[PDB]
Design a protein around this ligand. Sequence first.
Ligand code: MG
Ligand code: MG
Ligand code: MG
Ligand code: ZN
Ligand code: ZN
Lengths: 908, 114, 106, 63
Amino acid sequence: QSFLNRVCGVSAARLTPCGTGTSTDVVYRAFDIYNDKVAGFAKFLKTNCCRFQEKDEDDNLIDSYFVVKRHTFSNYQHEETIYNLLKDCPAVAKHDFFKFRIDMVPHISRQRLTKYTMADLVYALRHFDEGNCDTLKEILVTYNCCDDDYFNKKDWYDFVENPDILRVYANLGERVRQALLKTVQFCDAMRNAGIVGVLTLDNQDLNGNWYDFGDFIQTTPGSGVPVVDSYYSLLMPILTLTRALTAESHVDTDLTKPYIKWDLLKYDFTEERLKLFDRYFKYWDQTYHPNCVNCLDDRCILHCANFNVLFSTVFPPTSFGPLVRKIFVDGVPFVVSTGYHFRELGVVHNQDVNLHSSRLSFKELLVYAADPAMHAASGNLLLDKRTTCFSVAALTNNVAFQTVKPGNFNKDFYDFAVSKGFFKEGSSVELKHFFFAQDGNAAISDYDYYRYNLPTMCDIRQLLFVVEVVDKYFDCYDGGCINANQVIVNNLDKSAGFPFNKWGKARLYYDSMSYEDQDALFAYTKRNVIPTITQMNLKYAISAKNRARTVAGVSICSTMTNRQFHQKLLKSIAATRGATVVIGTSKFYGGWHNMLKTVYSDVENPHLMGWDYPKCDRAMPNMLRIMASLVLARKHTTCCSLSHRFYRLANECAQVLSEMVMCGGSLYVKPGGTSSGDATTAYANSVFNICQAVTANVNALLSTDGNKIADKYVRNLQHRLYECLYRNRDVDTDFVNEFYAYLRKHFSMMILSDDAVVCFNSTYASQGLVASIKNFKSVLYYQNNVFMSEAKCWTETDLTKGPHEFCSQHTMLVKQGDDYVYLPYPDPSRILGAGCFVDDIVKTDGTLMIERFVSLAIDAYPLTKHPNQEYADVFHLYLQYIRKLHDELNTSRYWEPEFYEAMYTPHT
Amino acid sequence: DKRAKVTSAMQTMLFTMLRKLDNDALNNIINNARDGCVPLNIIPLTTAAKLMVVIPDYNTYKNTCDGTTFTYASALWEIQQVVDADSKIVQLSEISMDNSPNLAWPLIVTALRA
Amino acid sequence: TSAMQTMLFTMLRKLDNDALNNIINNARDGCVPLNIIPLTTAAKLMVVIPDYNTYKNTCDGTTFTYASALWEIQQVVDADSKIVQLSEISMDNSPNWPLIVTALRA
Amino acid sequence: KMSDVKCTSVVLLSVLQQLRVESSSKLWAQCVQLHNDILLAKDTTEAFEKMVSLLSVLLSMQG
RNA sequence: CCCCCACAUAGC
RNA sequence: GCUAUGUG
Ligand SMILES: [Mg+2]
Ligand SMILES: [Mg+2]
Ligand SMILES: [Mg+2]
Ligand SMILES: [Zn+2]
Ligand SMILES: [Zn+2]
């Protein structure tokens, strides 16, 4: 008992051996490692430490531990020399240096350390797997965020089912903030002591103390430089998952004190942002611009926006949004927006403002009518308790209470279908897709799903690498600003948004403005910020789910300029065949087979893996939408300067990201996420999809043991990946090409908007060298605030059966002609429900039903090749109904089935 | 031209929407600003006369606006009217816990600045 | 406008469930429910009976049948605010017409 | 069998929506609740019970 | 009364 | 040029 009598020392603590006594215990903790051998953020075995738990007087166990590491004599003398230069810092754990005769061997005894370091909590939240949460459960239990019976409820981890888990993590937040303050004090002591080293997360206790001084080097005092890039960068998602700076809203940053009564007219907060940065991120080496209008390039906009996401959670929500000013026209006081305050981009002031103008021509009154300033100033104050979202104004004295009408019934096709032996009890095909009617609160209950959007920081070094790899997926296209005469608009008889939908459709605004007026409007948006208002419309579709669908029709003053900004790149993406993004590719004439053989290219051990995003429209963070818009604007180095590109980014982020959305005659603010009526929503969704897949591969490659990797090219790739993320701040433009070639060889993808199917290497994913479904689940947990259910996302082992689900189409291999052709077939319930239920009763006229049913039969031809017989009889029923209708009132004529098999033959 | 017609329509709606503003508390907080500009989110919060609260159930009613006066946005509000979702006029005496399943929720109360 | 009711009644006759044809042929005689029929046990139901032969068929002693379910009679209003007992009305004193009965699910 | 229940509930709610019952919110809310839980139903029993509820709602007013 | 963006397809 | 349908 002599060694246990020695470890207590003069601290006077009652101790019990946690492991076997007078020998080291073997634990399995997460580490942050960078040597010449192995680099990454993974879990390892720590076998050089013997640990003792401290007991209270009532002998229940205490969280304080005595971690004794016995090492070489060199590290002993070195850490004694350095700890004597650091024992006066408060944020350094107590070290007792002694020697003992187990044969003497040097011993380093640390005092009152915690069972789990900061890296354990960071790895447990960033690599989350259900049924493997024992470290996270132990941390959540021992810090009274919740008791042990909280986990007996299942779906407790889910942010969508159980939103009390954010309230659980907010109790870890203040311990995280105290750890941040102790980190800043430790960096101050390191600089004033003349010590140069790197701060890693696994050397920090959950109390905030720091305890491992082996790798540190002395310098002259006052000249020490600590390295905190990997520390803050890996810690950044935890700061907004646990809401670490929520104590800064109080009067002297104390939780047992009331809130700060900020002035309502205050909007700047720039000194507050700089003061917060110097309080918590003092030794972060890159410069922080609070307003991102002073940012050099887009890789600085991402940096300062990622800091503004965290810092804008302190400031009150009334200070954000447009900045209005009194402006006279012929001596008549108006109120128009001469700026915008962004949660992400800081304060942005318009450049071209006319305080006095005698006349108001068409362009400036279009800008003044699209502004939310006049509407939100003239309207009544609104307090909507149905919604968690911040409500600003109500434009009427009434409240709109629109409902969803049920779908009309086609009795004739149902009688024809029961005449042909369908819908017998026990057949595999039945009705499962109907028009679901909704009550009056449907629009506001669907708008309340924007509560899933939470302010989310990103790993900014990891995100800055991932944006460079995602830009490689968009290399073969070209883009740039086109003129107003070069635009191509599909349907002019669509609504122009609020408030423009009163006076006419978008045809009136494209026929009333000349090309010079549209080009002047685009040139205005390149130098000013126009905020707009998007109306929430209820979508009228047929579905299997009970939920309502809401689209966000953006006004004409945003889409008219977004078309000229993005149209060349979007048309180039839609025109290119064979690439990763498959927008614009037909599924007809062998296009489905061509896409599947494009994915199935050279992957050695191919499986097929497909996933889905839970609430992709709502839970999309603002950093990833900003990154998608920056990637799509990276095609503008010739036609736009840096200021023009930032003002276009600010215009788009003020029009489709933090817009003033009018849901039923009363304005609300939108917390974030994509908009369905954006001019570029599919392509930004594709950028976000490629971003999540690339960062899942990065998290897969960095969180494996580099020693256990058999290959040495892959191990060197991992060691270079950690360096390109967390060491160099330049973009290593040839390692980016190497990682892009590695992902093209082993993780080949097909990406439409949010649906995706990959063809990955089985032996690499089973070794943990590319992404699997587990890494996708972890990435969507920490970067998307959702839980991707494993029961939805699928894995396919056999190649000759294609992907299970892509664009809601199932695929089957068939012999067409003489060669084996993949064909897409839908679910027969969807085609049958589209046949027997129509959206309007005027569409049950025969001159429209012949067109509707020939289109439904073109979509339903590849069911005849299916082995199930009633699936094959679906198309025969549709064809016989078209025969009946056509006989009521030749391969190019549409009542004989070779017309429908010509749509899937590859020769056109 | 029809561009003249739509620009006349937008001109009249701008002219009506500026008369709807009354410039007293607007001019006070605009001219009290330092740079001359204020956030839009505090313009109806400190300028508007009417307030409309939409209350979904009865337990929300007893916390936010119960009685004839209530305090929201650091001001006193006097309840002018209470109208249910069918646009009918509802009295204050109808709102009770025993009568609450008979009421057509949500209620849309209308308050004026004191 | 008018044909959608005829198509609904055609497929209602094609359904041929006993509760549905029971309710529609009681509605053919003038027996009309005044509130939404509940399916929870022990919930209130309002229904009217227009004549005495409808009382002969529909009302059954102390527990009357409706929608192929039995309902316990509690209280009757003859639309004149006269609370009618179960022992009061018989065929001897059938002039009192239609009378509103509350009920509970058995 | 059960498919005709769903196909007649959709046209029953269509007749109700044409009889201007959507002006009354308190009635239309439970009508669409009954109709949605008819279409989501997988059994004949609860479908026919909610069917007699919706038909009693129709037969409440004259039409 | 409201009914978005993008792509594919069919008939004139 | 109009209409319709599928997909996100
Ligand atoms: Mg360590
Ligand atoms: Mg999705
Ligand atoms: Mg999908
Ligand atoms: Zn910057
Ligand atoms: Zn440009």
